[PDB]
Amino acid sequence: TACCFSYTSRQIPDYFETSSQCSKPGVIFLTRQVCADPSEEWVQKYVSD
């Protein structure tokens, strides 16, 4: 049960939605397991989705 405290600034190159209450929202990305925000990279999960 993840809760993302800091995102990666650089979007690159499955998913999760931290919005289970949590401190903040986020998209954990399996790849490591790297953390994201809501800005443009929503391509990958909403564009490649």
Partner: protein, 218 residues
Amino acid sequence: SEEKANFCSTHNDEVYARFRLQMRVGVRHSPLYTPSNMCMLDIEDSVEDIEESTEKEYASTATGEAAGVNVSVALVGEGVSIPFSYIGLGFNPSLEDSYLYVNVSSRAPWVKQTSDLSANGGWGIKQVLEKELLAIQIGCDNQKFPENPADIDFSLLVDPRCVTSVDLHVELRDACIDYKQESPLSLKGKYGDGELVKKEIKDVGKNHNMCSLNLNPG
């Protein structure tokens, strides 16, 4: 240091990265947690391929587990290896809410020369700067519960069931910066109160268990 300055002086023209992370994690335990003094430490280095790029991926991954909390700290470079050599844990084994302290440090060039990143008109630096990633992950492992360009790029992921807070200071800098007015390589990263944890972590050995792993030099 005795070893250090005499080395640094010998390489005025070079840049060798040095990574340091001081981190304090707010801990709390489940009702069923059973106090333990155990401490598990590892540092393992991986190479993977980006097929997109000509470049290989180099991650140095430091892990530590004490007090029911398991911590992962991976430094991921692209075409460039910054390797960890030391991880330090400071923890309280009891069931009570406490703080957990983690040191991680990369290898010292005077101990075992890392790569010189100034080479090829600074080829490595552009890499570190453009694609270096820091991934820190923290979990309550095995536990069962009742149901700008100077800024380092880190993802910080944690479990709220055992992690109450996180504060950390992290730096990725020119190793011999103490002998340079400027350096093209000087990266900083804070979460919460870094300047605090940087002091505080320097004296928790009085009231904490302390374990440490240091890799062979040579």
